[PDB]
């Protein structure tokens, strides 16, 4: 039903409070988020960095995680 897509990932600080995934890691930088930063999660419900994804994402456009195809593209 309802859809709805510009061509980008949602922007969020993540929260020491509500867990929004049971597992925060970033497979890029093999490094968790902090509070208070810049992340961003991919279409195939995986967190990571607005920075790292930004650098990986430019190199493949994939998830270095699921291989999962993201879909769009930035740039
Ligand atoms: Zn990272
Ligand atoms: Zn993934």
């Not at 890691?25 to 195939?44: G, H, I, K, N, T």
């Amino acid at each position: 039903g309802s859809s709805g897509s510009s061509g980008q990932l949602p922007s969020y600080r993540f929260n020491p409070n509500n867990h929004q995934s049971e597992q925060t890691l970033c497979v890029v930088c093999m490094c968790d988020f902090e509070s208070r930063q810049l992340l961003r999660v991919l279409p195939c419900n995986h967190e990571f960095h607005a920075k790292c994804v930004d650098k990986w994402l430019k190199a493949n456009r994939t998830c270095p995680i699921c291989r999962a195809d993201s879909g769009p593209s930035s740039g």
